[PDB]
Amino acid sequence: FVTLEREGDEKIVLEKGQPFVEPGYYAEMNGEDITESVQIKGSVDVNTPGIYNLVYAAYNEDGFAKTFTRTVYVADNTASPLKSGIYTVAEGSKRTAPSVVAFSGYEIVIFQMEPGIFYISDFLGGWYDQRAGYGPDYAMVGKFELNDDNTITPLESYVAGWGDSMDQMTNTLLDPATGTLKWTVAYAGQLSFDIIVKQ
Protein backbone atom coordinates (compact mmCIF):
# COMPACT_ATOMS: atom_id res chain seq x y z
CA PHE A 1 0.00 0.00 0.00
CA VAL A 2 2.79 2.39 1.03
CA THR A 3 5.32 2.69 -1.83
CA LEU A 4 8.81 4.18 -1.57
CA GLU A 5 11.03 4.96 -4.58
CA ARG A 6 14.54 6.44 -4.54
CA GLU A 7 15.42 8.85 -7.32
CA GLY A 8 19.11 9.22 -8.18
CA ASP A 9 22.00 6.93 -7.36
CA GLU A 10 22.26 4.80 -4.21
CA LYS A 11 25.92 5.86 -4.05
CA ILE A 12 27.23 9.31 -4.92
CA VAL A 13 30.74 10.79 -4.89
CA LEU A 14 31.17 14.55 -4.42
CA GLU A 15 34.39 16.53 -4.26
CA LYS A 16 35.02 18.64 -1.15
CA GLY A 17 33.29 21.98 -1.54
CA GLN A 18 30.79 20.81 -4.14
CA PRO A 19 27.24 21.28 -2.81
CA PHE A 20 25.09 18.26 -2.20
CA VAL A 21 21.87 18.62 -4.20
CA GLU A 22 19.28 16.12 -2.99
CA PRO A 23 18.45 13.82 -5.94
CA GLY A 24 14.92 13.32 -4.56
CA TYR A 25 12.45 10.49 -3.97
CA TYR A 26 8.74 9.66 -4.11
CA ALA A 27 6.27 7.95 -1.78
CA GLU A 28 2.62 6.96 -2.11
CA MET A 29 0.20 5.21 0.24
CA ASN A 30 -3.11 3.89 -1.08
CA GLY A 31 -2.88 6.07 -4.18
CA GLU A 32 -2.42 9.40 -2.39
CA ASP A 33 0.98 11.11 -2.61
CA ILE A 34 2.75 11.06 0.75
CA THR A 35 6.16 12.28 -0.41
CA GLU A 36 6.29 15.23 1.98
CA SER A 37 5.78 12.75 4.89
CA VAL A 38 9.16 11.09 4.30
CA GLN A 39 11.71 11.79 7.04
CA ILE A 40 15.50 11.58 6.69
CA LYS A 41 18.16 10.64 9.22
CA GLY A 42 21.53 11.95 8.15
CA SER A 43 23.45 14.97 6.87
CA VAL A 44 26.13 15.58 4.25
CA ASP A 45 29.12 17.76 5.13
CA VAL A 46 30.64 18.57 1.74
CA ASN A 47 33.47 20.60 3.38
CA THR A 48 34.88 17.57 5.30
CA PRO A 49 35.91 14.49 3.27
CA GLY A 50 34.17 11.41 4.59
CA ILE A 51 31.24 9.01 4.30
CA TYR A 52 27.75 10.38 5.07
CA ASN A 53 24.77 8.01 5.25
CA LEU A 54 21.25 9.29 4.77
CA VAL A 55 18.27 7.09 5.61
CA TYR A 56 14.79 7.86 4.23
CA ALA A 57 11.59 6.49 5.85
CA ALA A 58 7.93 6.24 4.81
CA TYR A 59 5.56 5.36 7.62
CA ASN A 60 2.54 3.06 7.59
CA GLU A 61 -0.36 2.27 9.86
CA ASP A 62 0.84 -0.13 12.62
CA GLY A 63 4.50 0.61 13.30
CA PHE A 64 5.49 -0.46 9.79
CA ALA A 65 7.79 1.49 7.49
CA LYS A 66 9.72 1.31 4.24
CA THR A 67 13.26 2.59 4.02
CA PHE A 68 16.01 3.25 1.58
CA THR A 69 19.58 4.32 2.18
CA ARG A 70 21.81 6.59 0.13
CA THR A 71 25.52 7.11 0.83
CA VAL A 72 27.46 10.25 -0.14
CA TYR A 73 31.25 10.24 -0.26
CA VAL A 74 33.27 13.44 -0.08
CA ALA A 75 36.72 13.34 -1.75
CA ASP A 76 39.70 15.65 -1.19
CA ASN A 77 40.10 17.69 -4.47
CA THR A 78 43.91 17.43 -4.16
CA ALA A 79 45.31 16.51 -7.56
CA SER A 80 45.95 12.79 -7.98
CA PRO A 81 45.93 10.53 -11.06
CA LEU A 82 43.35 8.38 -9.21
CA LYS A 83 40.01 10.03 -9.61
CA SER A 84 37.21 9.61 -7.08
CA GLY A 85 35.22 7.57 -7.81
CA ILE A 86 32.44 5.12 -8.72
CA TYR A 87 34.51 2.36 -10.31
CA THR A 88 33.06 -0.58 -12.25
CA VAL A 89 34.96 -3.86 -12.14
CA ALA A 90 36.36 -4.62 -15.60
CA GLU A 91 36.24 -7.75 -17.74
CA GLY A 92 39.70 -9.30 -17.35
CA SER A 93 38.76 -9.78 -13.69
CA LYS A 94 38.99 -13.27 -12.26
CA ARG A 95 39.47 -15.60 -9.35
CA THR A 96 42.73 -17.56 -9.64
CA ALA A 97 42.51 -20.00 -6.68
CA PRO A 98 41.43 -22.63 -6.01
CA SER A 99 39.69 -22.62 -9.42
CA VAL A 100 39.46 -19.82 -12.02
CA VAL A 101 36.27 -17.73 -12.41
CA ALA A 102 35.82 -14.41 -14.25
CA PHE A 103 33.32 -11.75 -13.16
CA SER A 104 31.40 -8.80 -14.44
CA GLY A 105 30.50 -5.15 -13.82
CA TYR A 106 29.88 -4.77 -10.11
CA GLU A 107 30.47 -1.25 -8.85
CA ILE A 108 32.65 -0.18 -5.93
CA VAL A 109 33.50 3.28 -4.60
CA ILE A 110 37.03 4.72 -4.30
CA PHE A 111 37.60 8.18 -2.87
CA GLN A 112 40.52 10.21 -1.48
CA MET A 113 40.45 10.67 2.31
CA GLU A 114 43.60 12.86 2.41
CA PRO A 115 46.20 13.64 -0.27
CA GLY A 116 47.94 10.29 -0.61
CA ILE A 117 45.35 8.02 0.85
CA PHE A 118 42.25 6.41 -0.61
CA TYR A 119 39.29 4.41 0.68
CA ILE A 120 37.75 1.45 -1.14
CA SER A 121 34.32 -0.08 -0.56
CA ASP A 122 35.66 -3.47 -1.69
CA PHE A 123 39.16 -4.73 -2.52
CA LEU A 124 37.53 -8.02 -3.47
CA GLY A 125 35.62 -6.69 -6.50
CA GLY A 126 32.17 -7.52 -5.21
CA TRP A 127 32.87 -11.26 -5.23
CA TYR A 128 31.16 -11.95 -1.87
CA ASP A 129 28.51 -9.32 -1.51
CA GLN A 130 27.02 -8.67 -4.93
CA ARG A 131 28.20 -11.85 -6.85
CA ALA A 132 26.89 -14.11 -4.04
CA GLY A 133 24.65 -11.53 -2.44
CA TYR A 134 26.20 -11.98 0.98
CA GLY A 135 25.75 -8.25 1.60
CA PRO A 136 27.92 -5.36 2.76
CA ASP A 137 29.22 -7.29 5.83
CA TYR A 138 31.37 -9.03 3.21
CA ALA A 139 33.75 -7.43 0.76
CA MET A 140 36.99 -5.79 1.89
CA VAL A 141 36.80 -2.22 3.02
CA GLY A 142 40.25 -0.70 3.25
CA LYS A 143 42.50 2.31 2.96
CA PHE A 144 45.46 2.39 0.63
CA GLU A 145 48.22 4.81 -0.27
CA LEU A 146 48.93 5.73 -3.88
CA ASN A 147 52.67 5.74 -4.57
CA ASP A 148 54.61 8.01 -6.88
CA ASP A 149 55.36 4.94 -9.02
CA ASN A 150 51.72 4.18 -9.87
CA THR A 151 51.55 1.30 -7.46
CA ILE A 152 49.25 0.99 -4.48
CA THR A 153 50.30 0.13 -0.93
CA PRO A 154 47.46 -1.25 1.21
CA LEU A 155 47.12 -0.13 4.79
CA GLU A 156 44.14 -1.37 6.80
CA SER A 157 41.71 -3.92 5.23
CA TYR A 158 38.81 -5.86 6.77
CA VAL A 159 35.88 -8.20 6.04
CA ALA A 160 33.36 -7.93 8.88
CA GLY A 161 31.32 -11.00 9.49
CA TRP A 162 34.53 -13.04 9.12
CA GLY A 163 36.86 -10.64 10.99
CA ASP A 164 40.05 -11.01 8.91
CA SER A 165 42.16 -8.92 6.51
CA MET A 166 43.86 -9.81 3.24
CA ASP A 167 46.85 -12.14 3.43
CA GLN A 168 48.81 -10.06 0.91
CA MET A 169 48.52 -7.81 -2.14
CA THR A 170 50.81 -7.74 -5.16
CA ASN A 171 51.06 -6.98 -8.87
CA THR A 172 49.43 -3.59 -8.61
CA LEU A 173 49.45 -0.76 -11.12
CA LEU A 174 47.61 2.49 -11.88
CA ASP A 175 47.52 3.67 -15.49
CA PRO A 176 47.37 7.53 -15.44
CA ALA A 177 45.31 7.43 -18.68
CA THR A 178 42.52 4.99 -19.35
CA GLY A 179 42.63 5.65 -15.57
CA THR A 180 42.56 1.99 -14.60
CA LEU A 181 43.41 0.44 -11.26
CA LYS A 182 44.43 -3.20 -10.86
CA TRP A 183 45.69 -5.38 -8.03
CA THR A 184 46.04 -8.98 -7.05
CA VAL A 185 44.85 -9.64 -3.51
CA ALA A 186 45.29 -12.99 -1.77
CA TYR A 187 42.65 -13.70 0.87
CA ALA A 188 41.60 -16.50 3.28
CA GLY A 189 44.62 -18.80 3.29
CA GLN A 190 44.31 -20.19 -0.24
CA LEU A 191 42.39 -17.65 -2.33
CA SER A 192 43.55 -15.09 -4.86
CA PHE A 193 41.84 -12.58 -7.12
CA ASP A 194 43.02 -10.37 -10.00
CA ILE A 195 40.81 -7.24 -10.08
CA ILE A 196 40.63 -4.49 -12.74
CA VAL A 197 38.42 -1.42 -12.17
CA LYS A 198 37.36 1.23 -14.71
CA GLN A 199 34.92 4.13 -14.78
Write out the E strands in 77-131: 85-89, 94-97, 101-102, 107-114, 117-120
Q: What is the experimental method?
A: X-ray
In angstroms, what is the resolution? 3.1
CA atoms within 13 A on the CB side of 172: 20
Write out the E strands in the chain: 2-6, 11-14, 25-29, 32-33, 39-41, 50-59, 65-74, 85-89, 94-97, 101-102, 107-114, 117-120, 141-146, 152-158, 168-175, 180-186, 192-198
> Sign of the C-alpha dihedral, residues 35, 37, 42, 46?
positive
Q: Is 39 exposed, middle or buried (0-12, 13-18, 19+ CB in 10 A)?
A: exposed
Whether 117 contacts 126, CB under 8 Å: no
Question: Does residue 55 come out as left (phi exceeding 0), alpha (psi in the -120 to 50 range) or beta?
Answer: beta
